[PDB]
Amino acid sequence: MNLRAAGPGWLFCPADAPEAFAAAAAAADVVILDLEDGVAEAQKPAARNALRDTPLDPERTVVRINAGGTADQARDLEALAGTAYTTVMLPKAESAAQVIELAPRDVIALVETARGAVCAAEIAAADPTVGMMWGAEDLIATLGGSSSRRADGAYRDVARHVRSTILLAASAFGRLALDAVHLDILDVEGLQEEARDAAAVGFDVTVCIHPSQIPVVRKAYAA
Amino acid sequence: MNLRAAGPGWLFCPADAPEAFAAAAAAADVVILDLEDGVAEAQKPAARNALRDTPLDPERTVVRINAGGTADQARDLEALAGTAYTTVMLPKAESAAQVIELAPRDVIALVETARGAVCAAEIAAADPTVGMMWGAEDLIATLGGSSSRRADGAYRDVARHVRSTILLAASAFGRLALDAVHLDILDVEGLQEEARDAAAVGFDVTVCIHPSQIPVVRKAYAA
Amino acid sequence: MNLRAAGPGWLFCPADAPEAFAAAAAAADVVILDLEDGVAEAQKPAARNALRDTPLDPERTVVRINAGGTADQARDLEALAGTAYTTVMLPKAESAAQVIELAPRDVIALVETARGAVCAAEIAAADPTVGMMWGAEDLIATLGGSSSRRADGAYRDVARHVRSTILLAASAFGRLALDAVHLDILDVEGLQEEARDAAAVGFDVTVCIHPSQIPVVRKAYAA
16 A cells, blocks of 8 residues: 555544445545454454455555454455455554564554564564554553553553554654554544644554544644 | 462561561561662671571562672572572563573562663563562662652653563563562652552552551552 | 763764864863764865864764765765774664674764664664764654654653663663753753753763853763
């Protein structure tokens, strides 16, 4: 894909909702059709069917598959066979090996565990990698914690640490850098603060979970 | 040891004070009998004797030995021979090699120097490692600095950086993560702030230097 | 050089201004004669001549050359041949290989890109390395960002992250650690805040761009 030529506003769309695919594509620069946590276990087969029969522009669409070694990932790659999509997003990305096993597809590695953070440079350097993202929710959950943000709403230090780690790793290897979702959709103030800062430090994209977040991201990245 | 099954409140007890061993054990989830900085040079031989003749439950006791390559460490491992203790804490932990040389004991690596921070993943990955701790005092001292905390009492950035480094390294390799001592014993407000945050981000333990700190730690880690 | 024996106040002096060399040397502990960004492209040949015909004490002078692989660097090393200088500062330092190729000179590696940050330990460990510095301006510029500082004037997180990275890498390998320039010359309050903190955490030097910054740095590092 010409990832950089596409704008900064990327939008998750659960793949079990094909009636929303066209609306997502019109709202966003890039849509991430989601086969992982956006879709309940029981509707994953239906999601994979929707992925096949309701296509989007593959120049502006990536598919978030399931994690390495899972039966779900294998089912996802089978469903992808029947599409035109070239680029996948790998959740819980933890090693170069997990990225390499996805060749010949392009891979956006989503680092959201300690092992992924520790191995970020190796992940970023892997040949299939075209982008790096981070996520604070599963980072804190897999660390054994309870909250990625403190009471005043700022990310805790370990999240801040991982954010910088992934920005540096991505940039060191010439990869797109994607900043984490702002989970509080109606908190447009916080999103604006994050996206302005992301743009300022060289993130290429801020990933969104609701179409209302796209204009705020696009404005933050204006220059 | 079943480290995780033991609670979050660990308590240093200088090994040259056997009259306090039973009181420490009753107050704490785990006692760290200390042969390093808790004990003056001249009383280290007496500490090693106390370690032998005044036993604690080895399921709930770890021994902090002296640093790699020191004559004191060699004397410590000799004294340990006559005990039932299985788990040691290695101060100034700086390489996998320093941990491996302690096999077949289990090792909690205490990272408190730049080299330890830089090599944290290697240390965490070493076969004997069961836990990682950090310390800001000796980190700043060995860096050549003067204060780990700024005037408003917050840790300086390099300390914050090392804290996250060790949390991630420990979690990446499935090790217990131990948060640093709160040196200002009577500052229970600061300890509560640190321990609540530690619990939130996935530390397993907050290490204490005074029995009064244990209830505050236990409450912070409640869930 | 006896780098540590020289004081904490280092001062950039563009090498195309030999009429200022003596004044810089009298004001500063160490002068960095600059052949890179301090000197416009068209005056670099003149700078290299000045470097030759207007000598400073080589015990108290380092030369900032141009980046690895550039034609300018090659011209710089040729000009250096005719001087007594032993120690160079390598901008945009990105690998051990870039440092090693400067042997047998001593090298202060200036990390100011993502790749340099990611490879900081390798850079620090390289045999010619005697010091590590960081720079936030080119870090943010090469990341693709727009501002190293947020609106309240604090460094953004990625800059803070790289600062700690370089401090740790330098200290882990026994190298001098140099803190970044305070670009707002008249902001002596901010410089004092930075230099006091730098001194506190174990930086050896704060690099300056104007002689007025030297007394503030010297006082901050007093103890």
